[PDB]
């Protein structure tokens, strides 16, 4: 797959940092899964 | 004759192109273009794209560009001409025109061809960084949410700043946060009784505001100053080690995080912030060992036991051992029954469940977090992002994240998320507005460069929608 920088939030709950690490993948699919592209 | 002479002239181009005789090849393609029977609707676009290929070998990037444009005007879905024109744009530093041509190519290839995808990603990163550095020079020093600052300082146990600068401490406990920098700046230029730690309180609020360039001299002084409490020296190395990670300098970051554990070996905050970093770098085995050292120093802590359990889940999950993955899953319920008010136990467990596709159980764990803390806006965001995975029901995904934005209008994770929903709905103008609302809450160039890649892909699909 793609590789992204480790964009730390400062002193945040580890669940929030693991959530930003996930949203990068939903952003990747969002531009392929859209009506303009289909 | 009429078609045959043009086809012959194309192959007379091909023989000279194979010979590397590129001028003679261009003359034969120019013969084909002159000889073509346009009244028969011959596919003249192919002669122009063939002519354009030879001008890459001569590296006349304006000529390959304009001969691809001739092919595209005759034949608007011809992928070879669009991709060759994109490469020519990149060489001419026409990055925006490259992005629009590669966006059309990705769409017309169904995103399958990874040569197109690599050029899109590179050009988006360069466009991203150029927009990011010019905005980041001009940003507001925007103070984050009070819920965020209280959650932040609740991460540091073994720290003279958090536990109880002497003027500044009043405004921390009264939450007048925008005063803190001003007091620390006059408690420096005084005796070490104030100065030696006013530096580190000031350096902490520069980091919270995203002003990392102003943080680095106040940290560098605190390391260099010999008489200051060893726990400030260790705490400053956590904050320098983190600053280097925003700069993506992992070797310099690692050197500081090791010096902290050499300098003050009986300090939980050093192993806590090392543990949280090592598990984001996916160096999982070092994270488990540093979280275990947090429990050794804080055995009564609910958070330390939640975190070590998530680290053993990530260790099993970077493996593929089903027995170890299932053992780690039960480990979160053992944490929850021991610590039934541990909100981060439910949030981390919900993410292990989310990741194991157990969406309906994960959703209940996010409800339990709302019962335990109604002010936690990010749970409505983790519940909204769950909808985007839980058979993608985008309609109610908006409603959840709208409620999240209403609880805390500074949650940049909420705006960035709802931007991707508006993208999946095709509503690109409102997606770009959501990403702009996230950009106005970024803390670094590294974050703005990522959000501007999203705006530029949304613009490029808006321009391809016309074509």
Mutate: best of B276, B283, B308, B310, partner A, most A CBs <10 A:
B276
Out of A13, A30, A37, the one facing B344 most closely (by C-beta) is A13
Angstroms from A1 CA to nearest CA on chain B: 11
- In the block, tokens 């990010």 appear at B378
Residues of B in contact with A33 (CB under 8 A): 424
| Alpha-carbon span B451 to A24, nearest angstrom | 10
Which stretch of DSSP H or E encloses residue B290? Answer: helix B284-297
First to last CA, chain A: 22
CA B86 from centre of chain: 25
Residues of B in contact with A7 (CB under 8 A): 444, 446-447, 450
Domain residue spans of chain A: 10-38
Ramachandran region, residue B224 (left: φ > 0; alpha: ψ -120 to 50; beta: rest) = alpha
Looking at chain A, after which residues does the C atom sit over 2.5 Å from the next written N, breaking the chain? none
Pair B283, B274: CB distance under 8 Å: no
Angstroms from A25 CA to nearest CA on chain B: 11
| Contact status of A1 with chain B (Cβ, < 8 Å) | no
Residues of A in contact with B351 (CB under 8 A): 15, 18-19
Which stretch of DSSP H or E encloses residue B315? Answer: helix B302-318
CA A26 from centre of chain: 6
| Alpha-carbon span B158 to B238, nearest angstrom | 12
Q: What is the largest CA-CA distance in chain B?
A: 97
| Contact status of A13 with chain B (Cβ, < 8 Å) | yes
Q: Does B146-466 carry CATH code 1.10.1060.10?
A: no
Out of A19, A22, A36, the one facing B464 most closely (by C-beta) is A36
Paired tokens of B106: 């990705």
Pair B227, B203: CB distance under 8 Å: no
CA A7 from centre of chain: 10
A23–B273 CB contact, under 8 Å: no
A8–B121 CB contact, under 8 Å: no
For B212, which residue in chain A has the nearest alpha carbon? A10
For A36, which residue in chain B has the nearest alpha carbon? B465
A26–B420 CB contact, under 8 Å: yes
Angstroms from B91 CA to nearest CA on chain A: 24
For B466, which residue in chain A has the nearest alpha carbon? A36
| Alpha-carbon span A34 to A19, nearest angstrom | 23
Contacts of B396 (CB under 8 A, 6+ apart): B387
| Contact status of A34 with chain B (Cβ, < 8 Å) | yes
Pair B171, B177: CB distance under 8 Å: yes
CA B464 from centre of chain: 25
Q: How many CB atoms are closer than 10 A to CB B1?
A: 8
**Number of Cα atoms under 13 Å in the Cβ half of residue B171:** 16
Out of A6, A10, A27, the one facing B280 most closely (by C-beta) is A6
Write out the DSSP string of B143-199: PPPHHHHHHHHTT-SS-TTT---TTHHHHHHTT-GGGHHHHHHHHSSS-HHHHHHHH
Paired tokens of B445: 């160039």
Pair B222, B228: CB distance under 8 Å: yes
Out of A7, A21, A36, the one facing B426 most closely (by C-beta) is A36
- In the block, tokens 């794209």 appear at B49
Out of A9, A19, A24, the one facing B382 most closely (by C-beta) is A19
Taking alpha carbons only, the member of B177, B153, B147, B142 closest to residue B377 is: B147
The experimental method is: cryo-EM
Paired tokens of B235: 């705490």
Can you give the resolution of this entry in Å?
3.0
Burial class (CB in 10 A: 0-12, 13-18, 19+), B164: exposed
| Alpha-carbon span A9 to B245, nearest angstrom | 10
| Alpha-carbon span B390 to B148, nearest angstrom | 28
């Amino acid at each position: 797959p793609k590789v992204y920088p480790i964009i730390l939030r400062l002193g945040s709950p580890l669940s929030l940092n693991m959530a930003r690490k996930t949203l990068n993948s939903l952003e990747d699919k969002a531009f392929q899964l859209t009506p303009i592209a289909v | 004759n009429s078609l045959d002479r043009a086809q012959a002239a194309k192959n007379k181009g091909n023989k000279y192109f194979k010979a590397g005789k590129y001028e003679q090849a261009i003359q034969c393609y120019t013969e084909a273009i002159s000889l073509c029977p346009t009244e028969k609707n011959v596919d003249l676009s192919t002669f122009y794209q063939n002519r354009a290929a030879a001008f890459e070998q001569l590296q006349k990037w304006k000529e390959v560009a304009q001969d691809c444009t001739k092919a595209v005007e005759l034949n608007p879905k011809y992928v070879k001409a669009l991709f060759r024109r994109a490469k020519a744009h990149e060489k001419l530093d026409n990055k925006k025109e490259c992005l629009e041509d590669v966006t059309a190519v990705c769409i017309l290839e169904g995103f399958q061809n990874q040569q197109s995808m690599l050029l899109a990603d590179k050009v988006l990163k360069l466009l991203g960084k150029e927009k990011a550095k010019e905005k980041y020079k001009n940003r507001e020093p925007l103070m984050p949410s009070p819920q965020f600052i209280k959650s932040y300082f609740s991460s540091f146990t073994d720290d003279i700043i958090s536990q109880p600068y002497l003027k500044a401490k009043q405004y921390m406990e009264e939450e007048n946060y925008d005063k803190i920098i001003s007091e620390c700046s006059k408690e420096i230029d005084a005796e070490g009784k104030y100065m030696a730690e006013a530096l580190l309180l000031r350096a902490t609020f520069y980091l919270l505001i995203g002003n990392a360039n102003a943080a680095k001299p106040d940290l560098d002084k605190v390391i260099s100053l010999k008489e200051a409490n060893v726990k400030l020296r260790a705490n400053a190395l956590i904050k320098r080690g983190s600053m280097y990670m925003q700069q993506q300098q992992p070797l310099l970051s690692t050197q500081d995080f090791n010096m902290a554990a050499d300098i003050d070996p009986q300090n939980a905050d050093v192993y806590h912030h090392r543990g949280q970093l090592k598990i984001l770098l996916d160096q999982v085995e070092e994270a488990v060992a540093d979280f275990d050292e947090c429990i050794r120093l804080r055995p009564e802590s609910a958070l330390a036991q939640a975190q070590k359990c998530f680290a053993l889940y990530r260790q099993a999950y970077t493996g593929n051992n089903s027995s170890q993955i299932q053992a780690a899953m039960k480990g979160f319920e053992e944490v929850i029954k021991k610590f039934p008010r541990c909100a981060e136990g439910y949030a981390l467990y919900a993410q292990a469940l989310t990741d194991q596709q157990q969406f309906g159980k994960a959703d209940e764990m996010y409800d339990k977090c709302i019962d335990l803390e109604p002010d936690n806006a990010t749970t409505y965001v983790h519940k909204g992002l769950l909808q985007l995975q839980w058979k993608q029901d985008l309609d109610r995904g908006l409603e959840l994240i709208s409620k999240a934005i209403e609880i805390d209008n500074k949650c940049d994770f909420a705006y960035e998320t709802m931007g991707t929903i508006e993208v999946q709905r095709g509503n690109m103008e409102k997606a770009i507005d959501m990403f702009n609302k996230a950009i106005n809450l970024a803390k670094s160039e590294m974050e703005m460069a990522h959000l501007y890649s999203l705006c530029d892909a949304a613009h490029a699909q808006t321009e391809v929608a016309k074509k």
